[PDB]
């Protein structure tokens, strides 16, 4: 019944050729970025005062050691796979690993690898498995990887043990920032002419946190099913932005409103009526 | 291969009031591969000391970035976001409009 924040650890490793390469990483707890990992750096940087959770300094340091060795070894393995399998540069690899905790001391995890922007393999249970639409050569690579007991045990226990203990330390240490509520502000605007006799009404909503929001154009309590909400766009201070438009004939605009619902308003919706 | 062209969205943090201080945002998203060149422009000239988010990616693996700078809107100043990518024949510019 308490809120659920999954931890997803992202990695971007790029290989322009046999010599030039860089690997960068970051980690997210729900919508918040807790960590950053730059190729120029030797450590994973913590972005929030509570990023280390309830981990000891020595526990955080052995993780820093695993990531140091993993980054070096990831790079050398890619270069050696490309030479053996005759792959063509440039190569781009992405990893998406992490877990989410549940009530009942259960937990599910994932570790997905992508090549040129498409899934090729993942870690399932105890070993590596290829995806259905994985190129033929990926099967030669899975074979070599699954011979590496040490790495398989290490990935297994990172996902099934380390990751869930870590996120639970983040959930209490960052309890307060995760429950924080920031009220949005909304304003009205007119957009470029959609048609000859038509108007584009624009509703701007900015500065809300957390991410879940509800914004629709209304005529009283009848929702206007023609509302086009955009993407939820980020602000530099980690609140969000939304623009919600409606195409209507000139005369029907009168009597329409833009309604905003958000956890921060405690039922007190923002309702702005058309000029 | 399958390369994805970037989507560019330009917006301000607060309702633009001429002469008041504001933040100018450019969210660049849905592109692949990751190498990208993003600039914010003041009357076609590049702005310096502009900050950006750590490069990240969505479930479908396309990348996204947020570039932003503090700025003061006026009646005649034109702001834009200029992006170049492998998928683009020329650098693409998206002007800012308070709508």
């Amino acid at each position, epitope marked *: 019944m308490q809120r659920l924040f999954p931890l997803r650890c992202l990695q971007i490793s790029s290989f322009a050729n046999s010599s030039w390469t860089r690997t960068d990483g970051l980690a997210w707890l729900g919508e918040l970025q807790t960590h950053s990992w730059s190729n120029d750096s030797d450590t994973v940087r913590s972005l929030k005062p509570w990023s280390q959770g309830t981990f000891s300094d020595q526990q955080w340091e052995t993780l820093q050691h695993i990531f140091r060795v993993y980054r070096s070894s990831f790079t050398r393995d890619v270069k050696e796979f490309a030479k*053996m*399998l*005759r*792959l*063509s540069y440039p190569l781009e690899l992405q990893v998406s690993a992490g877990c989410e905790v549940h009530p009942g001391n259960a937990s599910n995890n994932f570790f997905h690898v992508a*090549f*040129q922007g*498409k899934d090729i393999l993942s870690f399932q249970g105890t070993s590596w498995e*290829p995806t*259905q639409e994985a*190129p*033929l*050569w990926v*099967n*030669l690579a*899975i*074979q070599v990887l699954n011979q590496d007991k040490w790495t398989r045990e290490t990935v297994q226990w990172l996902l099934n043990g380390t990751c869930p203990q870590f996120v639970s330390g983040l959930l209490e240490s960052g309890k307060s920032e995760l429950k924080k509520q920031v009220k949005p502000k909304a304003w009205l605007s007119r957009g470029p002419s959609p048609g000859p006799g038509r108007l584009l009404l624009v509703c701007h909503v900015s500065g809300f946190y957390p991410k879940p929001v509800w914004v629709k154009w209304m005529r009283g309590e009848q929702e206007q099913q023609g509302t086009q909400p955009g993407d939820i766009l980020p602000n530099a201070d980690e609140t969000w932005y939304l623009r919600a438009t409606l195409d209507v004939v000139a005369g029907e605009a009168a009597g329409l409103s833009c309604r905003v619902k958000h956890s921060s308003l405690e039922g007190q919706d923002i309702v702005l009526y058309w000029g | *291969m*399958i390369q994805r062209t970037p989507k560019i969205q330009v917006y301000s943090r607060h309702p633009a009031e001429n002469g008041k201080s504001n933040f100018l945002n450019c969210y660049v998203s849905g592109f692949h591969p990751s190498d990208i060149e993003v600039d914010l422009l003041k009357n076609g000239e590049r702005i310096e000391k502009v900050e950006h988010s750590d490069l990240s990616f969505s479930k479908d693996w396309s990348f996204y970035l947020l570039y932003y700078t503090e700025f003061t809107p006026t009646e005649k100043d034109e702001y834009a976001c200029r992006v170049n990518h492998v998928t683009l024949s020329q650098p693409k510019i998206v002007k800012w409009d308070r709508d």
Partner: nanobody, 117 residues
Framework: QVQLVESGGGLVQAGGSLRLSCAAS????????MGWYRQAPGKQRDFLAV???????NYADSVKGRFTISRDNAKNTAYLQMNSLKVEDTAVYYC????????????WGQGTQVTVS
């Protein structure tokens, strides 16, 4: 161009053997890895076996032990010797190649039918 042509399919009794072949056209340098998939009626195409120019192989667990993949680099052709066939092996068997310069997708053959009665 790349051209993969299969042969060796047919119809055989349960317990029998069959040997499929795949002739590729191009250099020995332009084909990197060769392999086999199969698709039963109304199901997905499943990976079966792969072999590199150096001779390294990988087999899917369903067939590990019954099928063996082989390669003749002089004629740039791959073989799949199928032994101890079961009825569940009835499918279209497709040839696949990893062609130099194309790492994101396979090159495919038109397939050859294998029916086991």
């Amino acid at each position: 161009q790349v051209q993969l042509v299969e042969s060796g399919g047919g119809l055989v009794q349960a317990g029998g053997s069959l040997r499929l072949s795949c002739a590729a056209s191009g250099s020995i340098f332009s084909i990197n890895a060769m392999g086999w998939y199969r698709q039963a009626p109304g199901k997905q195409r499943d990976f079966l076996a792969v072999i590199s120019s150096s001779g390294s192989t990988n087999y899917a667990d369903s067939v590990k032990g019954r099928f063996t993949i082989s390669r003749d680099n002089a004629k740039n052709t791959a073989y799949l010797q199928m032994n101890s066939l079961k009825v569940e092996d009835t499918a279209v068997y497709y040839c696949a190649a990893h062609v130099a310069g194309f790492d994101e997708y396979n090159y495919w053959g038109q397939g050859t039918q294998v029916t086991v009665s």
